[PDB]
Each structure stands twice: as C-alpha cells, then as structure tokens.
Design a protein around this ligand. Structure first.
Ligand code: HEM
Ligand SMILES: *[C@@H]1O[C@H](CO)[C@@H](O[C@@H]2O[C@H](CO)[C@@H](O)[C@H](O)[C@H]2NC(C)=O)[C@H](O)[C@H]1NC(C)=O
Ligand SMILES: *[C@@H]1O[C@H](CO)[C@@H](O[C@@H]2O[C@H](CO)[C@@H](O)[C@H](O)[C@H]2NC(C)=O)[C@H](O)[C@H]1NC(C)=O
Ligand SMILES: *[C@@H]1O[C@H](CO)[C@@H](O)[C@H](O)[C@H]1NC(C)=O
Ligand SMILES: *[C@@H]1O[C@H](CO)[C@@H](O)[C@H](O)[C@H]1NC(C)=O
Ligand SMILES: [Ca+2]
Ligand SMILES: [K+]
Ligand SMILES: [K+]
Ligand SMILES: [Zn+2]
Length: 595
C-alpha cells in the first residue's frame, strides 16, 4: 500500500496526558486521537479533493482538459475583469477600524499555514519557473492573459509553486493529494510560540529562569521590546531597503514580517507575554522559568480565544453568529479540531478588507511627520520603518483611528495587493494576491462554488438569472458567467466573496456557514478551550472575562488614550478614553501559596 507519507518533520512524542499545558505541536489535545489538530498533518477535507486527473493535477493544468466541459479562466483574467478597481474614494468600512482587518490575519495565522514546496533551495528549478514560466512538477505559473499590462513590464507569467502536500513525490496506493497544515489547528497563540519544539525553544529566553520570550538586543522602542531579528540570509526585509539593511523579525510564525501592521501585532503579543511573565514572577517568586513561560503562554492563548469569539466573530458573522456558534456546552472530544482545506480559502475574505495606505499618527492622533500616510505596497516585508522610523506606537494609533476597507462587489481588492504584492522569494512589487488565491484554490483541489453552496444547504445557481439573484448584482453575475460559463466552475475564493454580506456581518451566506462551522469546531474540539472546566479556575475565568485589545495596547505601548471597543470605527478624541478607565487583567487569582 504506498504511503506517500513525507510532507515535513512530525517530531513524535509520548503524550503527558496530565499536563495542564498544551504541547507546542498541538499533539495530545485529543486523548483518543493525539495527532488530531497537531501541526505538519493534512488539512481536513469537508468534501473530497477535486483534481483534473482525480489525484494531484489542478484544474487549469492541461490546456485541453475541461472542468464540466468548460476551460477554467486564467487566474489573472478573473483578477483583471472582476477583482480590480481604480478609485479608493468611498471604499472604507465606516464601522470597522483597521484593527478589524489586522486581527483577522492574526487569527488566520494562528490556525493554518500551507507552505509552498521547498526543493528550490539554491535551485535552477526556481529559474525554470520564474525566468522561463515552464509548467511542471511544483511550478504551476500564473500566465498573463492577452492585453495584460504586466506582459509589457514583467514577462509572460507570475511564478507560483504548489502547496506542500504529504510532501514532494506523487505515487501511492492511489489517494488524492492532501495539503499540510504547518501550524496547530487550535487557537493557542502558536504564531507567538511556534508550532515546532526546536523553534519554540530558540524563541525563549533560557539565559534567565524568568519564563520570558527572547527580545531584540540591537534595538528598543523607547525602552519597549522588539522581536529578535531573523538572521537567515538572504532577507526579503533587507532587500526592500539595502541602505537601512533591517532584517525580518523572528516569531513563532514564518509570515510575521509580511507587512508592517502584522509585524506590529506580533510585537504587541510578545510584549504581553513578557509583561505576564514578570507579573507572575512577582505573585509567585518560587515559580521556575518553565512554569512562568507555560502559565503566561496559557493566559496569552485564552486572550486570543476571548478577543476572537467575543469581539471579532460577531462583527464578521453578524446575524449568523448564534446559528453557527451557540453558547458553549463544554468540550466535545468527538468534534474534529483540524482546520479544513476550504477554511484556508474562506478566511481569505480579509484580502478585500485591506486598504491602499497605512498611516503613522502622533499622540493627538494627527499625521506623524511629512510621510505619515504610505502606500501599502512599500510596507510588505518592511521592518526598517519600525526600527528606523518611530517604533510601533504610530502604527498602533493608525490601527485604532483608521478604517478597514469595506468589501465592494465593484471594488474587491486594492491594486496595492492585486498588482504590487512582494513575495519573500522574489525581487519585485509585481505579484497579484487575488490571482495567487485563485491559482491556490486549484492547487488545493477545491470543489467549486455550487459544491460548497450545497455543503452549506444553500440554493445552487445554474443560470445567469440564478447567479444574478444570489449575488443581487447583474453585471457581476454576467462577468462571472462569461469567464466561468457555469457557476459550478466558479473558484471558491471569488465565489464566496462575490456574495453580499449577511445582516450585521462582513461576509456573505456561504462564507458565514464555512467560517461559522470551522470556529464552532476549534472551540468545541479544543480540550484546552479557556471555558473548558479545569483549564482555569472559576476565578481565573472571572479575571479573563475583562481582557480587551484596548488594555493590551495600554499595557504594552506609550499610548495613554484608546477606545473602549477597538474593532468599531473610532475617531479621536470623542471615542477615546484614558487608559486608567480601562479594565485591567487582575492576576491575583494565579497566586500559588503552598501554605
Ligand atoms: C496587507 C495584508 C495582507 C497581506 C499582504 C496578505 C498576504 C497573503 C499572502 C501572500 C498569502 C499567501 C497566498 C498563497 O500563496 O496562496 C496569504 C494567505 C492568506 N491570507 Fe492573507 N494577507 C493579508 C491580510 C489578510 C487578512 C486580513 C486575512 C484574514 C482576515 C488574511 C487571511 C489569509 C489566509 C487565510 C491565507 C491563507 C493562509 C495564510 O495566511 O498563509 N490575510 N495572505
Ligand atoms: C533574558 O533575560 C535577562 C534578565 O531579565 C535579560 O537581561 C537584562 O536585560 C535588560 C535589558 O537589556 C537589562 O537592563 C538588564 O540589566 C539585563 N540583566 C542581565 C542579568 O543581564 C536578557 O537580555 C534577556 N535576553 C534576551 C535575549 O531577551
Ligand atoms: C459531540 O459531537 C458529536 C459529533 O458531532 C455529536 O454526535 C451526534 O449526536 C447525535 C445525537 O443523536 C447523532 O444524531 C449524530 O449522528 C451524532 N454524530 C455525529 C453527527 O457525528 C454529538 O451531538 C455531540 N455530543 C455531545 C455530548 O454534545
Ligand atoms: C458598529 O458596530 C458595533 C458592533 O460591532 C455596533 O454595536 C455599533 O452600533 C456600530 N456603530 C455604528 C454603526 O457606527
Ligand atoms: C532606506 O532607509 C533610509 C534610512 O535607513 C531612508 O532614508 C531611505 O529613504 C530608505 N530607502 C528606501 C528605498 O525606502
Ligand atoms: Ca494554532
Ligand atoms: K475541504
Ligand atoms: K497570511
Ligand atoms: Zn515612549
């Protein structure tokens, strides 16, 4: 029976089973099935994988082979015709701060990561893909359609490498290709701590018995910590400004430096871990480093769980929140905690919530110097603008005082992401996230729009008129039909995001159902869910109920004025209160007296 079992390293351990702490890897959470939700395993399949050849070849591989008797449109064609827009005026979400966008990416990165196949480490395979646009093996290039401006300027294609599967060879006992989740399916702050023991240890301060995470020794933010530098070379962050030569940050997550506001959030969380560890050292001076690390790690985890379920999901799911995530009825070990392949595409709704600029604000929330507002694309893999240009406080103020972009059927993804994306492997602000998203859908063997509509119990539009009624939009339906010919072939990422938003929410019905069910499962199937009896004391839970992102900022920056509800659109000064008004995390319930 050939077992194409290769993917990546699965550390292997015997489960403690009576540890009050999560493993780094996510192993041992489910006692009956200790690998369930652990990193470096196949994403769960809610529907069977759909491949050109039933095994591995994505739809669009063989220019000839159809999907239900239709050619699939070029990913860049779909992007150009549907996803692009010119006018950034009027596009901002009037009731979501920029923090709404940024928290989404944080939650996402905690939950799932499907890394591109390596093998191209000091490689000519890279060259044959980038330089020659040659399809084969893991090179699945994004070809430019006719009349594409990038044809005139960049070449024939954007290079694209297929997601890591149960790893580099394609021959088995005949099974469909399954993409790997490199991070823990649990909402467990894995993007801070790592999902791999070796990295998790390297991130820690083992020089002192104080359970701290390692902090940068070369640079400080007016006394406050930065992440360490990643000193792996070559550095994409060094490359975007070779004068400054400021490398990417080293974090529990490989993607931490992808853009400056994600770098910022990673900084906030690390600071909070050290603050937590110092407070617990005061309360319990007998606690050793391991105990301090795990107990701070455990609080920070529940903090992420609480902000996500109390503050974030309701303003994503709106009317559908209670349908998919009713009140918690305790841990259910029969619930699958693993993130689904399809969820990794559903949650990419965030790409339509990213605006075209980022602002640095001063202490009166006014523009910070002459270059306050920057084009998004200049901030991809940009750490020098933090280290060499004001630290994180100006960007945090921007997160509070500026707005997420609203998803718009006529204005889906900003050109900053749709034309000017920088990839860490490559040299150009020339990539298309929307085209990459659609290519990746096919790479991952995604069933089509109507397959998922069916999965979610929703009508399956079969005609122009049907799609016009689902989408409440005649031109979008038409452009969609001209490209895809049947709604059956519409790739899940554009399909789900095309649908108008549910009442009081920021996604359509299909996405709500998909995200709703996934978030129900990561709660109910998590043995270390913060509300699971025995994980915290009743009193520790009473303390935890009072956490807010506003407090996190108050406690880990020199910002003294914050809004009470950090996710809604807030203007300074009317919506901003002094930090002394904000509920604190009372840690007195973590005091441990042997007497
Ligand atoms: C400036 C902001 C952002 C940038 C530059 C960015 C960039 C990227 C890139 C390059 C990928 C990998 C695409 C692939 O190769 O398949 C990706 C994936 C993804 N993004 Fe985003 N993204 C941003 C914001 C967001 C937000 C706000 C969310 C959710 C609310 C989000 C959710 C995801 C998800 C779920 C994936 C797939 C898994 C992963 O994150 O690696 N992204 N993003
Ligand atoms: C590990 O923890 C130690 C001790 O808390 C850190 O050393 C202190 O760092 C601060 C700021 O650099 C200094 O003011 C203290 O004087 C240092 N104390 C000692 C004992 O040297 C140390 O930098 C931490 N290491 C890392 C890599 O974060
Ligand atoms: C825990 O989760 C399991 C799996 O979702 C649930 O199992 C279902 O229970 C009902 C009750 O009769 C059956 O009709 C289903 O067929 C069961 N299995 C399924 C759907 O997988 C169960 O409801 C949950 N158990 C508790 C105690 O809440
Ligand atoms: C903004 O959203 C919140 C819920 O997220 C809601 O309570 C409030 O009424 C809204 N404010 C507006 C529409 O400005
Ligand atoms: C690079 O950083 C320096 C300061 O290090 C700054 O003066 C310069 O404008 C930056 N260059 C680019 C290309 O962003
Ligand atoms: Ca995780
Ligand atoms: K799936
Ligand atoms: K990402
Ligand atoms: Zn300061």
């Amino acid at each position: 029976s050939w077992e194409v079992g290769c993917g990546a390293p699965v550390p292997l351990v015997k489960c403690d089973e009576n540890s009050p702490y999560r493993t780094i890897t996510g192993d041992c959470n489910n006692r009956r099935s200790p690998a369930l939700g652990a990193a470096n395993r196949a994403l769960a399949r809610w529907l069977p994988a759909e491949y050109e050849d039933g095994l591995a070849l994505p739809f669009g591989w063989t220019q000839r082979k159809t999907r239900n008797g239709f050619r699939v449109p070029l990913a860049r064609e779909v992007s150009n015709k549907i996803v692009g827009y010119l006018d950034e005026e009027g596009v901002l979400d009037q009731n979501r701060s920029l923090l709404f966008m940024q928290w989404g990416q944080i939650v996402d990165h905690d939950l799932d990561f499907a890394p591109e196949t390596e093998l191209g480490s000091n490689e000519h395979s890279k060259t044959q893909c980038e330089e020659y646009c040659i399809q084969g093996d893991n090179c699945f290039p994004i070809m430019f359609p006719k009349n594409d401006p990038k044809l005139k300027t960049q070449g024939k294609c954007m290079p694209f490498f297929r997601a890591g599967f149960v790893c580099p060879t394609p021959p088995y006992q005949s099974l469909a290709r399954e993409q790997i989740n490199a991070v823990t399916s649990f909402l467990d702050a894995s993007l801070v701590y790592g999902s791999e023991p070796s990295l998790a240890s390297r991130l820690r301060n083992l020089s002192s018995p104080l359970g701290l995470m390692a902090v940068n020794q070369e640079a400080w933010d007016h006394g406050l910590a930065y992440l360490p530098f990643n000193n792996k070379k070559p550095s994409p962050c060094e490359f975007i400004n070779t004068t400054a030569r400021v490398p990417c940050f080293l974090a529990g997550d490989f993607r931490a430096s992808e853009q400056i506001l994600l770098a910022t959030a990673h900084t906030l969380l690390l600071r909070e871990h050290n603050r937590l560890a110092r407070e617990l050292k005061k309360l319990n001076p007998h606690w050793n480093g391991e105990k301090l690390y795990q107990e701070a790690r455990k609080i920070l985890g529940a903090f992420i769980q609480i902000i996500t379920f109390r503050d974030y999901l309701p303003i994503v799911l709106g009317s559908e929140m209670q349908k998919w995530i009713p009140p918690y009825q305790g841990y259910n070990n029969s619930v699958d905690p693993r993130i689904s392949n399809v969820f990794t595409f559903a949650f990419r709704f965030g790409h339509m919530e990213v605006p075209s600029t980022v602002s640095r604000l001063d202490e009166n929330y006014q523009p910070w110097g002459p270059e306050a507002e920057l084009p998004l694309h200049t901030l991809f893999f940009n750490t020098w603008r933090i280290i060499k240009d004001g630290g994180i406080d100006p960007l945090v103020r921007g997160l509070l005082a500026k707005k997420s972009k609203l998803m718009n059927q006529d204005k889906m993804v900003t050109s900053e992401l749709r034309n000017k994306l920088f990839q860490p492997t490559h040299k150009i602000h020339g990539f298309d996230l929307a085209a990459i998203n659609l290519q990746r859908c096919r790479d991952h063997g995604m069933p089509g729009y109507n397959s998922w509509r069916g999965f979610c119990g929703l009508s399956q539009p079969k005609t122009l008129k049907g799609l016009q009624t689902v989408l409440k939009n005649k031109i979008l339906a038409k452009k969609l039909m001209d490209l895809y010919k049947t709604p059956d072939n519409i790739d899940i990422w554009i399909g789900g995001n095309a649908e108008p938003m549910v009442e009081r929410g920021r996604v359509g019905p299909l996405l709500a159902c998909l995200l709703g069910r996934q978030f129900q499962q990561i709660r109910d199937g998590d043995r270390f869910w913060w509300e699971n009896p025995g994980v915290f004391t009743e009193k520790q839970r009473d303390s935890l109920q009072k956490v807010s992102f506003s407090r996190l900022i108050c406690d880990n920056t020199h910002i003294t004025k914050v809004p009470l509800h950090a996710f809604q659109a807030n203007n300074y000064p009317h919506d901003f209160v002094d930090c002394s008004t904000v509920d604190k995390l009372d840690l007195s319930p973590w005091a441990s007296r042997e007497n």
